[PDB]
């Protein structure tokens, strides 16, 4: 990896465009006005890409040669990058201040700020915009995952009276549905801020290396079938497949995809009659988890539950909702996103089925069908010093007040009512709102403040 080649091309040309005698460029990231966002993922970027000796003679030469062809011209700031190599042993003279990871902050607040610590390196602040702005992704995954946790918590509490099992109710199925291995690890880690169930194994190593947990692993899975392991037996032998699988995994939970040919026949006849003896004998710690995977998600879940309710001994819990026996559960992992998850739990509640009975899997909805524009994430210069004079700067496009940016040096504060406010124009310096909540997390090539994954999870808890 070469940081000289990890920016938007145009930024290679910007050192020639700032006002002469500019000594400081100061910029900030916000999720510009999903009312609150989980701040998560900057620490991964600081450690993997920004800290330590990130400039060498070889990387400068590599970049020089690439840009000469890419621009068909010499624009590359060879001298400026060489200055960093010679003066600072290739450590970036940058200071980044940030809200603690895991913090849940309303939209429109400063989340981190970036500025150069050497006047010669005024151009460096925005060089690294591109790489820092990618923090949008773990923020957005963590935020959207937490929003689904809120929905699940509301309905689980209402239909059952407690939150038991909540952290296992939304399982990450998105490894194949993301755009890369690196994205899989980042997104899966962001989901694990809120939940514990994951099939996206890449998330584990990332958390272990960059954040750390008291537990050996931050997430867990269970054995589960896929269509190849059912259909390989042949269409006439779906029962033999089911029997073999539950018997191989007789003492741990096992998920078995049941819709290869006819989900309703599988539930009613195969599970509900032919193999019923192998289900009712299972432990509470080792249920069969039936997995439909096609059809209208709500309609399918309701009909599956109706079928099972007729074949197995249903109880009524203390809230008056129906509950399958403890050895039998359902997981819906097709077509799941925040919208359909809401539709399913509401439809279940309306038909008097406890949310205890169900869990969800989600792949693309969880890790891929998200963009930087969902929380309007963006990074802008708000302050410059030119000719020794500090100036508060901003953009304010006539036709889109939504793209208006903040002015001057920024700080994040608690209000007297304990909400958040971002103070502009250096007004934090007046101290009418107590101390700035941002902390220096990176300075001159070093990570200066860090959070464990356990701390992040605590910061990210729901109010309930």
Q: Which of residues 319-338 bind ligand NMN (CB under 6 A)?
A: 333-334, 336
Q: Of the candidates 292, 365, 408, 445, which one interacts with ligand NMN according to CB under 6 A?
A: 365
The C-alpha angle with vertex 51 and arms to 45 and 57, in degrees rounded to 5, equals 120
Q: Of the candidates 79, 209, 395, 414, which one interacts with ligand BEF according to CB under 6 A?
A: 395
Q: Per the annotation, where are the binding residues for diphosphate?
A: 176, 227, 291
**Closer residue to a copy of itself, CB minimum distance, 67 or 451:** 67
Whose tokens are 């269970």? That residue is 222
Q: If contact means CB under 5 to 8 A according to the sort of partner, which of ligand NMN, ligand BEF, Mg ion, none does residue 395 touch?
A: ligand BEF
Q: Which of residues 288-307 bind a copy of itself (CB under 8 A)?
A: 293-296, 300
Cα–Cα nearest to 378, from 206, 127, 64, 132 = 132
Q: Of the candidates 86, 89, 182, 226, which one interacts with ligand BEF according to CB under 6 A?
A: 226
Binding mask 310-349 for a copy of itself (x = CB under 8 A): ----------------------------------------
**Closer residue to a copy of itself, CB minimum distance, 98 or 267:** 267
First to last CA, the chain: 43
How far apart are CB 438 and ligand NMN at their closest, in Å? 25
Category of 324 on φ-ψ map: left (φ > 0), alpha (ψ -120 to 50) or beta: beta
Q: According to the binding rule CB under 8 A, does residue 35 interact with a copy of itself?
A: no
How far apart are CB 138 and ligand NMN at their closest, in Å? 17
114 secondary structure, DSSP code: E
Name the packing angle between helices 57-70 and 78-88 (round to 10°): 170
CA-CA distance, 452 to 40, in Å (whole number)?
11
CA-CA distance, 269 to 271, in Å (whole number)?
6
Cα–Cα nearest to 404, from 424, 387, 426 = 424
φ, ψ dihedrals at 83, nearest 5°: -55, -50
Three-state DSSP at 22 gives: strand
Residue 226 and residue 258 in contact, taking contact as beta carbons nearer than 8 Å: no
191 secondary structure, DSSP code: H
Q: Which of residues 291-330 bind ligand BEF (CB under 6 A)?
A: 293
How far apart are CB 254 and ligand BEF at their closest, in Å? 15
How far apart are CB 29 and ligand NMN at their closest, in Å? 15
How far apart are CB 19 and a copy of itself at their closest, in Å? 5
Q: Which residue is nearest to ligand NMN (CB)?
A: 363
CA-CA distance, 89 to 1, in Å (whole number)?
17
CA-CA distance, 123 to 23, in Å (whole number)?
9
Q: Of the candidates 98, 114, 178, 308, which one interacts with a copy of itself according to CB under 8 A?
A: 178
**Closer residue to a copy of itself, CB minimum distance, 95 or 238:** 238
**Residues near ligand BEF, by CB under 6 A:** 226-227, 293, 380, 395
**Residues near ligand NMN, by CB under 6 A:** 8, 10, 173-174, 177, 199, 224, 255, 291, 293, 333-334, 336, 361-365, 372
């Amino acid at each position: 990896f070469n940081i000289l080649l990890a920016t938007d091309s145009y930024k290679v040309t910007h050192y020639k465009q700032y006002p002469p005698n500019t000594s400081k460029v100061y910029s900030y990231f916000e999720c510009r006005e999903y009312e609150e966002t989980v701040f998560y993922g900057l620490q991964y970027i600081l450690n993997k890409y920004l800290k330590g000796k990130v400039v060498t003679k070889e990387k400068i030469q590599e970049a020089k040669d690439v840009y000469k062809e890419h621009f068909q011209d010499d624009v590359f700031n060879e001298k400026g990058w060489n200055y960093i190599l010679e003066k600072y042993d290739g450590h970036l003279p940058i200071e980044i201040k940030a809200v603690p990871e895991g913090f849940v902050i309303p939209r429109g607040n400063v989340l981190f700020t970036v500025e150069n610590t050497d006047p010669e390196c005024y151009w460096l602040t925005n060089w690294i915009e591109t790489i820092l702005v990618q923090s949008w992704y773990p923020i957005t995954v963590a935020t959207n995952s937490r929003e689904q946790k809120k929905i699940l918590a509301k309905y689980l509490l209402e239909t059952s009276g407690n939150l038991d099992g909540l952290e296992y109710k939304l399982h990450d199925f998105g490894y194949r549905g993301v755009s890369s291995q690196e994205t899989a690890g980042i997104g899966a880690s962001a989901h694990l801020v809120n939940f514990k169930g994951t099939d996206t194994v890449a998330g584990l190593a990332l958390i272990k290396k960059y954040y750390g947990t008291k537990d050996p692993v931050p997430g867990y899975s269970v054995p589960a079938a896929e269509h190849s392991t059912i259909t390989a037996w042949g269409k006439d032998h779906e029962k033999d497949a089911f029997e073999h699988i539950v018997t191989q995994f007789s003492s741990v939970p096992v998920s078995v995809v049941s819709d290869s040919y006819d989900i309703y026949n599988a539930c009613e006849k195969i599970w509900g009659e032919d193999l019923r003896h192998l289900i009712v004998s299972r432990s509470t710690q080792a249920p069969l988890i039936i997995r439909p995977d096609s059809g209208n998600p709500l309609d399918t879940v309701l009909k599956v539950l109706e079928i099972l309710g007729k074949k197995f001994p249903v109880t009524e819990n203390s809230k008056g909702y129906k509950l399958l026996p403890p050895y039998l559960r359902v997981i819906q992992g097709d077509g799941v996103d925040i919208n359909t998850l809401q539709e399913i739990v509401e439809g279940m509640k309306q038909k008097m089925w406890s949310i205890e009975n169900i869990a969800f899997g989600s792949g693309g909805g969880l890790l891929q069908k998200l963009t930087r524009d969902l929380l309007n994430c963006s990074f802008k210069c708000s302050y410059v010093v030119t000719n020794g004079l500090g100036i508060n700067v901003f953009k304010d496009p006539v036709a889109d007040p939504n793209k208006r940016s903040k002015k001057g040096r920024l700080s994040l504060h608690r209000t007297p009512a304990g909400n958040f406010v971002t103070l502009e124009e250096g007004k934090g310096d007046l101290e009418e709102y107590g101390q700035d909540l941002l902390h220096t997390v990176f300075k001159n090539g070093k990570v200066t403040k860090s959070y464990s994954f356990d701390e992040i999870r605590k910061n990210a808890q729901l109010n309930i």
